[PDB]
Design a protein around this ligand. Sequence first.
Ligand SMILES: C#CCN(C)Cc1nc(C2(O)CCNCC2)cs1
Length: 330
Amino acid sequence: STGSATTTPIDSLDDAYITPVQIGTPAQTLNLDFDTGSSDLWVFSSETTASEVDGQTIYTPSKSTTAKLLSGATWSISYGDGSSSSGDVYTDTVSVGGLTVTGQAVESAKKVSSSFTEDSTIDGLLGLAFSTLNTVSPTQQKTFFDNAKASLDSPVFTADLGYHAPGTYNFGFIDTTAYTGSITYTAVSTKQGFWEWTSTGYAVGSGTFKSTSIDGIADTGTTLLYLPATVVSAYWAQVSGAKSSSSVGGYVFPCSATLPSFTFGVGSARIVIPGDYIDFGPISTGSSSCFGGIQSSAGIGINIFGDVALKAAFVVFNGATTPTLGFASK
Ligand SMILES: C#CCN(C)Cc1nc(C2(O)CCNCC2)cs1
């Protein structure tokens, strides 16, 4: 089997991407944030505290003839940005772009943090990291991909995010028309539960390539690119007036600037992030200071190849017995 679904930026800055997902019988369609950096599928629901729902579409298990309470199971998650949610669990039928999984754990939110409430476009998350990170207790649950894997034509999914434009998540096949040149595959460590890999280095604009190993995770659920302070300082030093601001919480730059590209290494291959991708606009409406798309990972404990990097490539998440990650230009 295969699946193919379009993913769409939630705003003009590509802060996140939503993908329609069919849950239950008859289908309830929710727009979920596909997140290769976590492993819970959770949704706003009829059980979510009323004061914490503001515009989201909710899942109502009582209206689904295939919904079954997973008795005694609970979940609680907190993400890198400090946001969080928790609740209980149902199993139900879940379909993504024509691909159907029966008995999928659907984690129903009883509580969500303010940042989720304030984001009316995101009805939940669909985690695509390794199932060892799933937070359901006392019986850990499998991701949508983990459950679907045996039925897929090939045990893979691909992320093809657009720059200020829709993109595609495919399951079970590699669309050879969706990229240029060849796909370079690189080793993955699952020891932390992430799609963790090691980049071979970087370049700033037209500068010489610096060979240096940068361990990080491929995370569609993170907006920006987070790299070691040395690398990030080298990038912003090429932008007149750019500086790190503690009050804003990262590197800002003059909105009048033209940003240089940023290249990262995948084995012997190179992925180029256009300068425009690194511009996240005025820090506040009307401001002449703009927020940078490349930021320091120093206060995170891990480097994160988020959407800024990933949208510059066609990315293959290979969930074979020995998982690997593939990158192609597009
Ligand atoms: C490990 C480590 C340090 N972490 C507390 C910081 C991290 N945060 C994350 C995410 O929550 C970011 C959003 N997508 C899902 C993953 C991964 S690593």
